[PDB]
């Protein structure tokens, strides 16, 4: 397996202007370098690069173009209050990443090799991190299979590369704007068996239709639907958090258990842990179906919904179109005062406005 | 809109590969000299098609086909016959099932007759490839990519088309029926109810590759795909699955997993029934089938072969399946198996051209 200490850097010569943090659109940016390494079942991992960013040369027959033998992680750089850049819990990217890995039958390797190789490839390009407590700089390790063979085999060439791409805030306002989800259980996005809990690439293209469908009934994301009783699941690419009185008359957290079809994400679990921490109301991993969500609705128990994960902390959600009828969720109405309260809490984390073991200062 | 045949740009190589021999192929190791691309981006549409030279894609690394799996591919084949004419089989279903797929995956729309008259000139330009023998074929890869620079998860505005062409021998190199073992495992689901399963999306495969590896670890040629509370039994590893048996009511019975959107509709799937039902000599059923309904039937030696098709291998019979723990024995074998060969010697009469059929075509 590769070593960070083998790292061969070749820096580029011209370097791009920066983007204005506030005119980002996610995902379309890139930094000046890339970390590259090939893999060979006959020579093993070759030496870590960091290099200009460049077009990837690959075999047509590459197995990643034919069946999505790929997968790929996303963490975050904060630059702080006190001009620090931070990662955040980086280590649960990388425990997840080599698990999607074997998952894959991708190539395993040294978990903090990568993760240091990364903080050398954010640290070259660090002034990339934007100037902004509202933005940050995305990170996105990547792995393909690069074998230039159509057999469905395990394969015996791949590349891992990690990408860079400056985010500014999600809201355009810098606070909440709240989301309208499209609920068709027509579509679902992962299954019992499946991949759902991991990031292949395969879970992912088969959700642009359902986002396509969401988009034309004038919705900005699918909230995904599972089972014959409607489970709600995940609101687009995030977890999704219920705050709302339950059967038991009880003050509740709520949010989906992880069962296999639940991506379980960074802040998902942060979430969990600071609602625990607080111990001001119940907190359930639990299933929730949209007949316990208009019921709740009927008897005005919900307080507050929201989804959380790497494209946005909290995003409140404020109506669900659902068999033909659009359903308010009254979110924005009570504050929303637990969504406010854990923005604020992993901003402050995030930015450096406190300590935590959640972050680690850039190498 | 589409690209057009009439606007194909051929770069003929200038230095060409040894063919290698017919008999010493191994599938998806080795490409022809000439590939098709064809660019598309949401600001102009389709740009002309060219066949050029096979050479690496240079894609930025931000592609979506690297990230999100947008992507899809097509497999089907050209057979040198015994009259030395090269014929496609049925390349329209191919057609009609990426175009299916691209809609599904959100990539670009294209007119199936002009990427039909594209794949014909690519073969022809590289047709002393088409191996010479009746046992051996070209394989004819359609793949189609997202190429957008960006890491939003969108329909994306700009993609890539390709074909490529490889050569295959024979699925058994023996040339003769060599029947597989199969690994059950209800805990690996390929596919389901409101997913992509009914396409031939990149995504589809990706999630199978750690479950062949299982079969293979005990000693299974191929994977049988289980689905749901009661083990219904789908496909067997990227192959369509018939059960040939007297049935619940004491019919004699041609029986495969009904379109239900988990079930691939295979090409040979899709020729199978027609000549079961074109013959009329049985009962053909698309139903469910369930580990249960096999054993129980198995127990009251009511099951006489049992099969895979797809264009891997036109009849792939099969001898065992390894579930919960117990090696279950199918006495395909035993059987002829009859019905296993008289698919096999049809299909392989008409890919060949040693009869006429509407199911071919001599190429362009
Ligand atoms: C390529 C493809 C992708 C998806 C669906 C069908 C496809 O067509 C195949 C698949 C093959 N295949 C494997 O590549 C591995 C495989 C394992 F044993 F690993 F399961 N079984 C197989 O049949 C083939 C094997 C030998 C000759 C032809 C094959 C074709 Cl044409
Ligand atoms: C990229 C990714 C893939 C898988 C899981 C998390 C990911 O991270 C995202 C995803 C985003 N995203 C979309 O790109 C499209 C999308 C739609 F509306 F189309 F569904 N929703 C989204 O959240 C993001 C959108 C804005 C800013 C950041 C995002 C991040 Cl960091
Ligand atoms: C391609 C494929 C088949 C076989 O279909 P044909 O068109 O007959 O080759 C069967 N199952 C799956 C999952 C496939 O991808
Ligand atoms: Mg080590
Ligand atoms: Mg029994």
Same mark, same amino acid.
């Given at each position: ?7 061969? $850097? ?18 379309? $940016? ?22 200009? *960013? ?32 931070? *990662? ?35 640290? *070259? ?41 400056? $985010? ?29 809990? %991991? ?19 004038? %919705? ?37 258990? *992880? ?105």
């Amino acid at each position: 397996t590769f070593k960070a200490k083998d790292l061969i $850097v070749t820096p580029a010569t011209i370097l791009k202007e920066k983007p204005d943090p506030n005119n980002l659109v996610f995902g379309t $940016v890139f930094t000046d370098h890339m970390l590259t390494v090939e893999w060979s079942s006959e020579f093993g991992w070759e030496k870590p690069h960091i290099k200009p *960013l460049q077009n990837l040369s690959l075999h047509p027959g590459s197995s990643a173009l034919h069946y999505a033998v790929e997968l790929f992680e996303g963490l975050k750089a904060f630059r702080g209050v006190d001009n620090k850049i931070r *990662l955040f819990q980086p280590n649960l990217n990388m425990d997840r990443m080599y698990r999607s890995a074997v998952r894959a039958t991708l190539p395993v390797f040294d978990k903090e090799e990568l993760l240091e190789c990364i903080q050398q490839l954010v640290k *070259l390009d660090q002034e990339w991190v934007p100037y902004s407590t509202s933005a940050s700089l995305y990170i996105r390790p990547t792995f393909i299979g690069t074998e230039p063979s159509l057999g469905v085999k395990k394969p015996t060439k791949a590349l891992l590369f990690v990408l860079l791409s400056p $985010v500014g805030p999600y809201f355009s306002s810098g606070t909440f704007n709240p989301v309208s989800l499209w609920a068709n259980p027509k579509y679902v996005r992962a299954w019992k068996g499946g991949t759902g809990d %991991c990031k292949m690439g395969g879970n992912y293209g088969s959700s642009l239709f359902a986002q396509c469908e969401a988009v034309d009934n004038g %919705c900005q994301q699918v909230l995904w639907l599972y089972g014959e009783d409607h489970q709600i699941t995940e609101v687009g690419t995030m977890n999704l958090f219920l705050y709302w009185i339950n059967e038991d008359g009880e003050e509740e957290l709520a949010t989906p258990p *992880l069962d296999g079809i639940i991506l379980p994400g960074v802040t998902r679990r942060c979430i969990l842990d600071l609602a625990h921490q607080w111990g001001e109301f119940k907190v359930s991993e639990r299933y929730l179906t949209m007949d316990d969500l208009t019921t709740a609705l009927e008897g005005n128990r919900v307080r507050e919904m929201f989804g959380s994960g790497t494209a946005c902390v909290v995003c409140p959600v404020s109506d669900i179109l659902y068999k033909g009828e659009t359903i308010h969720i009254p979110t924005m109405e009570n504050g929303p005062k637990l969504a406010s309260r854990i923005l604020s809490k992993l901003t402050d984390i995030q930015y450096g406005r406190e300590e935590r073991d959640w972050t680690i200062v850039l190498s």
